[PDB]
Design a protein around this ligand. Structure first.
Ligand SMILES: [Co+2]
Ligand SMILES: [Co+2]
Ligand SMILES: [Mg+2]
Ligand SMILES: [Mg+2]
Ligand SMILES: [Mg+2]
Ligand SMILES: [Mg+2]
Lengths: 201, 202
């Protein structure tokens, strides 16, 4: 059902934390993923949540400004960080399952300013030499653009507030929280479209 | 209220043709830009159209498979190609005009699988060392995502047909034609949201 809605695409919400803006050279530090489901009523809602702290890859650059921004101490002994390979492999495992079960044929990343998270995910996958990536190699569902249309807002915090959702700046910029808000935001935009009779055609 | 609609963003539709998928190493070959306007009743439609054939930058890589796809012959001196600098500077001049004329703050690129065209534009701007870029450095309005939501389709041709638009595959893959269809597609998605009472919010 989730797969008739988006021509076979299985939407998965993704947020990453990084040690910079350069996907090829800057450390991936954290990643959360939230799969979605469609109920009998045809409404969209979050399904499964995965979250991993990621160890900076060997040779990775780290910008203090980024660390200052996300508050991540890449040296905290009990971060419980895993390898980029480990995080993506575990996420890909869940995504692949959710795909076959719903009739989808490929995953698509839902993310806020999606090019960012997509570039980092693809770079991490490259690093680890992962051959089986369930995510579309270039297409994404950018919630910034989607909110621009739906809410006249492109900033995540502002978009959520405008959508009637709660948003907590003190929790903001953490992978789990941002992913969850982005997931709720995406479901709301889709549900609102259906609500107003935009869907089905 | 064009810049009331998108928190100050001035949406400009862009399509590029290239000699490959690598924005840093593959030649930019063509670029077309379509600005938008809003009428007094709040409806969105295309405004100004610009189009440039672009000369492959010095050292640029050319993928035959790309040239096979877009039918571009980078060697035909009849093509009338200009430098990447020339194309962007001319486009930027028109965009910069439109912004400070509608109370806008910045331009935002509208494009189909926008990350692609945005990467190529930014790469071209950087090679030419352009210092005044009116386009937002990372935000875009991807019509693939927007059509996914509005039409349940992510492929340009399919999204257009589903939207009720005419689409002609024999004209597809030309910068001018693709940009125009993309502009019409984007306007229709925005206008349809308004028609359905999705906008304004109150
Ligand atoms: Co990594
Ligand atoms: Co160039
Ligand atoms: Mg983020
Ligand atoms: Mg964050
Ligand atoms: Mg294109
Ligand atoms: Mg084209």
């Amino acid at each position: 059902g989730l797969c008739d809605r988006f021509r076979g695409f299985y939407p998965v919400v993704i947020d990453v934390e990084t040690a910079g803006f350069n996907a090829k050279t800057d450390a991936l530090l954290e990643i959360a993923a939230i799969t979605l489901k469609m109920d009998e009523q045809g409404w969209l809602m979050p399904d499964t949540t995965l979250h991993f702290h990621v160890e900076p890859f060997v040779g990775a650059n780290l910008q203090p400004e980024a660390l200052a921004f996300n508050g991540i101490d890449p040296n905290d002994p009990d971060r419980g960080a895993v390898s980029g390979y480990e995080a993506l492999h575990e996420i890909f495992k869940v995504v692949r399952k959710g795909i076959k079960a719903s009739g989808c044929n490929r995953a698509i990343m839902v993310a806020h300013n999606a090019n960012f998270d997509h570039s980092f995910m693809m770079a991490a996958a490259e690093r680890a030499s992962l051959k089986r990536n369930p995510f579309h190699p270039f297409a994404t569902f950018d919630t910034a653009a989607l909110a621009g249309l739906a809410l006249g807002q492109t900033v995540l915090s502002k978009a959520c507030q405008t959508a009637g959702m709660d948003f907590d700046s003190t929790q903001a910029h953490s992978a789990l929280y941002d992913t969850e808000r982005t997931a709720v935001l995406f479901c709301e935009i889709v549900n609102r479209w259906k609500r107003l009779g935009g869907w089905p055609l």
